[PDB]
């Protein structure tokens, strides 16, 4: 009837992930679908992607179909009265009846935040990875550059097996000296990502930043695509799905 | 026996306040004193100030007495293994056995965060005051200016019995366009503050920013020290105790 693109922000700490999983488990998709009826929409939400348990989102897109006559500009506010405090709709747009949040996406962007300081931070404990040791940003930037472009990224995926060639469009490191302390931010942009990939890339880069054979080691993992050569997956609370882009119309 | 000056950071949302309040409530003092014996210290902590339920601190000073031989360098880590996830020591320094965190403070600084944006922010729901309507930033600065200097701030106070005269050294607005929206930070620094004073000044300022008689109306509040004229107290989650300064002696 009317199909809308909903942008959602969520604190993923108290969710078992985005995808609805059954057996009572609390999920982002589950909670958005639980509230769609309240606005005259079918209880079905198709997401642009999938976030693991604990990972956050700034503007995760979902398309939904509303039977009702609610004006678009009224949808966020209305769904927000119904949604829990850790998941809110921060935008809505009328799209083509044809629109598909997952398939029509040009690209997806993620951001990982590391907070470098002598002591843990109660204020940012679920928002950034606390790292006590000094970090070698130069070694990290040289490894980051190895990841750019067309590669088989399976060496960084998780329970992933599937056709692994992806093309990383962007992989940059930013240091922003916040008050809660100094932060190192890793940004990644690509059409799509393997499941677990970003957290995978981040854990090995972190190893680079401390001590772990130089950026050089990342060429083997990209070449062979052998998971046992990467480092451990970075914790979920420092990861954020930033946004997805779609072609005009 | 040594007297140490501890600096603590805490997420105030799951605390009834800083000082003990009985009634079996969880407070910052309670939890710190709970941990202190694991370091061979007397289970007593005196803070530089007070924070209501929900308000935060980046560096709240506390003085404690340690009996053990523990090196100053090691107490933040030792206390942190024992403390809850929402409260940690981020600094420790030996001082005079005669040092008083509250009485010897030259000044205290506070910061309040307002985030102006169309929709709520689940990620910053316990860190900034969400405000939808734009803020007359001009009026707020005019009002802020009327607050600087020596006055009887009891009109901004709540349940205080001390002498109302204080000297507000700094009172400034800082706006930054940010990723989560427009960040409006209010900063205050004075020798000391009355109970509820900072939240009352912030609450009256929000009214100005939104539509409270002009900034002028704060004159009446300072002259008469009548709290009946002040605005509602500001929600706690946007307030942060930043730091305190002591004399080098």
Tell me whether strands A182-190 and B165-177 are parallel, antiparallel or unpaired: unpaired
Q: Is B186 helix (H, G, I), strand (E, B) or coil?
A: strand
Whether A127 contacts chain B with CB within 8 A: yes
Give A182→chain B minimum CA distance, Å.
14
C-alpha A127/C-alpha B70 separation (Å) is 32
| Both structure tokens of A58 | 């700034």
Among A39, A30, A94, which Cα is nearest to A67's?
A39
Q: Is A126 part of the contact surface with chain B (CB cutoff 8 Å)?
A: no
Among A183, A96, A202, A170, CA closest to A131? A183
Cβ under 8 Å to B: A residues 189-248: none
- Please name the member of A80, A119, A122 whose beta carbon is closest to the beta carbon of B85: A122
Cβ contact, residue pair A120, B10, below 8 Å:
no
Q: Do A118 and B10 touch (CB under 8 A)?
A: no
Closest alpha carbon to A31 in A90, A83, A91: A83
Among left, alpha and beta (phi > 0; psi -120 to 50; other), residue B9 is beta
Residue B245, classified by CB atoms within 10 Å of its CB into exposed (0-12), middle (13-18) or buried (19+), is: middle
Helix axes A197-209, A217-224, angle to 10 degrees: 160
3-state helix, strand, coil in chain B (%, to 5): 30, 30, 40
* Model resolution, angstroms: 2.2
Residues of B in contact with A120 (CB under 8 A): 80, 88
Residue A134, token pair as written in the block? 């000094």
3-state secondary structure of B3: strand
Looking up tokens 């009172």, which residue turns up? B171
Which residues of A make up each annotated binding site? Answer: 110
Domain membership of residue B236 as a residue range: 106-249
Which of A123, A176, A187 best probes binding to B when mutated, by most B CB atoms within 10 angstroms?
A: A123
What is the spatial distance between Cα B40 and Cα B36, in angstroms, rounded to a whole number? 7
Helices A137-147 & A217-224, crossing angle to 10 degrees?
20
Largest CA distance in chain B: 59
Quote the CA–CA distance of A184 and A237 in Å, as a whole number: 15
> Domain end: A58, A75, A105, which one?
A105
Contact A16, A25 (CB under 8 A): yes
Q: What is the DSSP letter of B192?
A: -
Q: Do A120 and B89 touch (CB under 8 A)?
A: no
Please tell me whether residues A192 and A239 are part of one structural domain. Answer: yes
Q: Pick from B105, B124, B143: which residue ends a domain?
A: B105
Q: Which of B9, B89, B125 sits opposite A85 (nearest CB)?
A: B125
Going through B68-158 in order, the beta strands assigned E by DSSP cover 87-95, 107-116, 129-131, 149-152
DSSP H or E segment with residue B57: strand B56-66
For position B157, which CATH number holds? 3.30.70.660
| Catalytic residue (one of B11, B52, B98, B136) | B52
B90/A11 touch (CB, cutoff 8 Å), yes or no: no
Name the residue among A196, A217, A223, A193 with its Cα closest to residue A205: A217
Copy the structure tokens of residue B64. 């404690």
For residues B84 and B158, state if they share a domain. no
Q: Which backbone phi and psi does A184 adopt, to 5 degrees? A: -110, 125
Report how far residue B24's alpha carbon sits from residue A12's, in angstroms, rounded to the nearest whole number.
31
Does residue A72 share a domain with residue A39?
Answer: yes
Cα–Cα separations (whole angstroms), residue A98 to A5, A50, A61, A106 = 12, 21, 15, 16
SS3 assignment, position B52: strand
Task: Extract the tokens encoding A101.
Answer: 């949040």
A50 and A69 both lie in a single domain = yes
Residues of B in contact with A11 (CB under 8 A): 122-123, 125
A3 φ/ψ angles, rounded to the nearest 5 degrees: -115, 135
Cβ neighbours of A69 (radius 10 Å): 8
* B224 in the same domain as B113: yes
Nearest CA in chain A to B126: A123
How far A228 CA sits from the closest chain B CA (Å)? 32
**Residues for chain B: how many in total?**
249
Q: Rounded to whole angstroms, how far apart are CA atoms A89 and A80?
A: 6
d(CA A41, CA A37): 5
Token readout for A148 is 């750019």
Pairwise CB contact (< 8 Å): B122 & A11: yes
- Using an 8 Å Cβ cutoff, are A152 and A164 in contact? yes
- Same domain? For A3 and A92 the reply is yes
CB contact under 8 A, A121 and B9: yes
Residue A14, Ramachandran bin (φ over 0: left; ψ between -120 and 50: alpha; else beta): alpha
Give the end-to-end CA distance of chain A in Å, rounded to a whole number. 17
Please report which residue ranges of chain B form alpha helices under DSSP H: 28-35, 75-82, 137-147, 197-210, 218-224
Residues with Cβ within 8 Å of A207's Cβ and at least 6 positions away in sequence, in order, are A231
CA neighbor of A168 nearest in space, from A220, A108, A98: A108
Distance between CA atoms of A204 and A200, rounded to whole angstroms?
7
* Longest Cα–Cα distance in chain A: 59
Assess contact for B195 and B123: CB atoms under 8 A.
Answer: no
Question: Could you tell me the two tokens for B239?
Answer: 């307030």
Contact A122 B88 (CB under 8 A): yes
SS3 assignment, position B86: coil
Among A87, A84, A46, A90, CA closest to A65:
A46
Give the residue from chain B lying closest to A59, CA to CA: B180
Task: Identify the sign of the CA torsion A124, A125, A131, A135.
Answer: negative
Which structure tokens are listed for B228?
Answer: 């009946």
Residue B80 sits in a domain of what CATH number? 3.30.70.580
Tell me the residues of chain A between 72 and 91 that have a Cβ less than 8 Å away from chain B: 76-77, 80, 85-91
Q: How many CA atoms lie within 13 A of B204 on its CB side?
A: 30
The residues that bridge with A159 in the sheet, in sequence order, are none
B2 at A interface, C-beta within 8 A: no
Q: Which residues are within 8 A (CB) of B154 and not within 5 positions of it... i.e. 6 or more apart?
A: B160, B164, B194, B225, B227
Cβ–Cβ < 8 Å for A203, A231: yes
A227 shares a domain with A118:
yes
**Cα end-to-end span (Å), chain B:** 20
d(CA B191, CA B163): 13
Please say whether the beta carbons of A220 and A204 come within 8 A. Answer: no
Task: Give the contacts of B74 (CB within 8 A, at least 6 positions apart).
Answer: none
Cβ–Cβ of B122/A88 closer than 8 Å? Answer: yes
Nearest CA in chain A to B57: A123
Do residues B118 and B214 share a domain?
A: yes
| Token representation of residue A140 | 């990290």
The residue of chain A nearest to residue B120, with distances taken between CA atoms, is A88
Q: Which residue has the tokens 């289970």?
A: B43
Rounded Cα distance, B37 and B159, in Å: 33
Beta B87-95 vs B2-10: how paired, if at all?
antiparallel
Q: Is B14 on the interface with A (CB under 8 A)?
A: no
CA distance B87 to chain A (A): 6
Tell me: do B141 and B99 sit in the same domain: no
Tell me if chain A has a CB within 8 Å of the CB of B11: yes
Q: Are residue B47 and residue B137 in the same domain, yes or no?
A: no
Count structural domains, chain A: 2
Cα distance between residue A47 and residue A37, in whole Å? 17
Helix (H) or strand (E) holding B5: strand B2-10
Q: Which residue of A has its CA nearest to B75?
A: A119
Running DSSP on this structure, what letter comes out for residue B41?
B
Q: How many CB atoms lie within 10 A of CB A235?
A: 17
**Are A93 and A130 contained in the same domain?**
no
Please report the DSSP string for chain A in residue order.
-EEEEEEEEE--TTSS-SS--STT---HHHHHHHHGGGGTB-S--EESS---TT-EEEEEEEEEEE-S---GGGHHHHHHHHS-TTEEEEEEEEE-TT--TTTT-SEEEEEEEEEESSS--TTTTTTSEEE-S---HHHHHHHHHHH-EEEE-GGG-SS--S--EEEEEEEEEEEEE-SS-EEEEEEEEES---TTHHHHHHHHHHHHHSSSS-TTHHHHHHHH--GGGS-PPPPGGGEEEEEEE----
Residue at token pair 């000082």:
B19
Touching check for A181 and chain B: CB below 8 Å? no
Q: In whole angstroms, what is the distance from residue A45 CA to residue A32 CA? A: 7
* Boundary-marking domain end, from A105, A124, A143: A105
> Three-class SS string for A171-208?
EEEEEEECCCCEEEEEEEEECCCCCCHHHHHHHHHHHH
Active site amino acids of A: 52
Distances (CA, A) of B216 to A130, B112, B139, B223: 45, 22, 9, 12
Nearest to B190 by CA among B157, B223, B234: B157
Q: Which two tokens stand for residue A93?
A: 């747009």
Q: Do B11 and A125 touch (CB under 8 A)?
A: yes
Q: Helix (H, G, I), strand (E, B), or coil: what is residue B143?
A: helix
* A170 and A115 within one domain: yes
**Across the interface, do B86 and A122 touch by the CB < 8 Å criterion?**
yes
- Write the residue in B80, B87, B122 that is nearest to A87 by C-beta: B122
Look-up of token digits 């360098």: B73
**B9: chain A residues, CB-CB within 8 Å:** 119, 121-123
């Amino acid at each position: 009837m009317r199909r809308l693109l909903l942008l959602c922000e969520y604190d993923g700490t108290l969710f078992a992930g985005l995808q609805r999983q059954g057996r009572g488990l609390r999920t982002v998709q589950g909670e958005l679908e639980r509230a769609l009826p309240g606005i005259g929409a079918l209880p079905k939400a198709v997401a642009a992607g999938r976030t693991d348990a604990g990972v956050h989102a700034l503007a995760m897109p979902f398309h939904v179909d509303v039977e009702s006559a609610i004006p678009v500009e009224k949808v966020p506010e209305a769904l927000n009265r119904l949604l829990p405090e850790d998941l809110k709709v921060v935008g809505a747009r009328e799209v083509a009846p044809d629109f598909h949040a997952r398939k029509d996406a040009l690209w997806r962007a993620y951001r990982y935040r590391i907070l470098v300081r002598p002591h843990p931070s109660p204020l940012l404990r679920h928002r950034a990875l606390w790292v006590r040791r000094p970090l070698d940003l130069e070694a990290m930037e040289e490894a980051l550059s190895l990841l750019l472009g067309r590669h088989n990224f399976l060496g960084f995926a998780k329970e992933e097996t599937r056709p692994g060639e992806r093309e990383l469009l962007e992989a940059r490191l930013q240091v922003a000296e916040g008050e809660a302390g100094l932060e190192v931010r890793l940004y990644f942009r690509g059409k799509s990502f393997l499941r677990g990939q970003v957290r995978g890339m981040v854990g090995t880069l972190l190893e680079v930043g401390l001590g772990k054979r130089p950026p050089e080691s990342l060429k083997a993992i990209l070449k062979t695509a052998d998971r046992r050569l990467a480092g451990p997956t970075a914790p979920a609370h420092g990861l954020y799905f930033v946004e997805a882009a779609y072609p005009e119309e």
